[model samples]
Target: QKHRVAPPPHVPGHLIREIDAYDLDGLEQGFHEAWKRVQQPDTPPLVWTPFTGGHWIATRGTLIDEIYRSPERFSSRVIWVPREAGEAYDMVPTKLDPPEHTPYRKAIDKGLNLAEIRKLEDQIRTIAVEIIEGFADRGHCEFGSEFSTVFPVRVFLALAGLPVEDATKLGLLANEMTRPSGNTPEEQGRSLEAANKGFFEYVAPIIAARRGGSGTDLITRILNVEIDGKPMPDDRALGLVSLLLLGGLDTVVNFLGFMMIYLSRHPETVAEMRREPLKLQRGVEELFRRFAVVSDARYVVSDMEFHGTMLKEGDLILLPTALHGLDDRHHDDPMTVDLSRRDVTHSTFAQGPHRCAGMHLARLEVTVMLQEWLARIPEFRLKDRAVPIYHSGIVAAVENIPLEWEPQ
Candidate 1:
């Protein structure tokens, strides 16, 4: 059953394949699994899926790449897949397009610049060591809740010059903003609203404190930045910072959960990681390509025809980053994990001007977690033979994962 709302006023229904893209039951098990179920065999790359009202979805790599690169045709004005969320969605540069976005993006680019990221490497390793030291001796533990979700997030909040103790407090907000849960539009907005409030309450004062003072953390860098030759207004700073918090914290949690669980099952990857410690970084590339986790959407700007289907202005489209990673046409044995696959292709951090700014930090943090955890706890497997349950939204994440290993 489709929402009573009319299908994008002028959709060429005949030209698009229709399916329930947001079938939570199917996805609750996992993203890659659910994607396989939803993908129509012997169909055009473009399809229509009705959930939170109707929208188009693209499964082909080249087609989605084209959509991402064609910024003008696809207005980011409504990035969220849910019509309700997109209507309320407003984040600094992520919501702004091109000319208006360039300066803001440039400032963040420097904030996560290579120099700053390298400086964080040693710090990230220390954080990883502290986190593992607490759990590795325990022999076995809940990887997602105990470590995967904890280590990177603590560092994320620290970069903002806030208390690492606040990771849980702020993490709740980031989680809801991306993977909101509720029955109605207003219900769905509950967590998103609370998150907005939380970000404002937590980050605003820090902005004020740093305005007249000097500091080198991200929040301070953002406060002092000038956009279009004028100091970025405090509100704009909050939006960008809020986005940074949300993206940095949530993105890592998504992949770490998946990565740890993937490693538990494929202990062979672990053997390789240990034998060739120099190979950890290279191996991680394949992990990212094979298990890419973020999912985002773009809005239709105006009435137009694409891939033989007509799209109405305001229509939402699903751009599943996970699908690109799983597209067999792009990679040999797409689902198989291959560390040696040179030039791995994936949209894990997205593309174009709106690409994830904190990716450098994410990669550093991810590398540290993998190398350190493997070195400390050499062997592990899923607890009680449990399977990881994944969640969906603008981003996808492991809801829970259990692991067990012999005392080492």
Candidate 2:
């Protein structure tokens, strides 16, 4: 059966907009451009759509931020779109709300905290350089597979104590979870279920092996994490590690693709970054603002009026991270990626208790990418006649970014 649900009496006719956050009408132009199409000044801050099981979307940055912080009102129990898929999402921290989410999230923080990621800095940079150098001499490379995909996957594998060779299998599984192929929500839900099952099955053995062990890898560290003054249980441990694997393989990989696409087109920006390495942090922040990608949803806890609209209990509202940074009210020239732009604000890592646990690591990865990539391949551009294809889903990504530069 198709997943369209009739809007209840609380939803008004004018407020009913048929926009699918996962499959946007604007994607044909570009990723960010696709999102900008939804944020037109005249559009309401929130709208209900029949697609994806008839959910609500908080179009403004402020509303998205407010909802993220207000877990009491909007539960995190169902973060995925299409009520069916979200119901199947049983991961830790993200899937758990408030106090229950606290300890497990702390365990994640303990492993990926600033201090821990800082220690991995040298290793991260080395991985970046190796991947970049591998294809640097080729003069032309598919940026996604050659560099973006391998570097982050390798870094994550190193951290998780997993073999580098398993990257292909795990990466595919992660990709399917975020961008499952289906014409309808039911098909997509099944796809999501299969991928989710595959991930749990793959990690089950690893979790079993590492449990009660003294191994020093990130997974081992997490497995040893205690909650309520007791060792974390295996089921919860499975959820946490599965979430980590999904997070590790995909987010940075896509971000790197988007960043490189921008840099390839704007050679001048690349030059500026190279000239002022110290200011790369500012440049990265601006880039983060311009390319905010994750588009997860939160379900309304109870029937209530919000931001001038009525939301029913269990109504799913998409809190796209991109909306905040691109909202004209928040930043001037919202579409332009200005490195000098001050006061860059975004929910790229999200807001409140559910903020991305790997944010520090993610930031460091991008910062290192800027420093290492610009230092070596100071100049590059998208290959002539090459057009990148964009995908919109739980996370947005660029594909076929054929990049070429002078061989040195």
Most lDDT-accurate candidate: 2
* Deviation from native of the Cα of residue 216 in model 1, angstroms: 1.8
Off by over 4 Å in 2: 1-4
lDDT (tens digit, per residue) of candidate 1 on 80-129: 75667776666778888897888999889778987889988888899899
Cα-based RMSD of candidate 2: 1.4
Using TM-score as the measure, the top candidate is 2
Once model 1 is optimally superposed onto the true structure by TM-score, how far is the C-alpha of residue 327 displaced, in angstroms? 0.8
Clash count (model 1, backbone only): 0
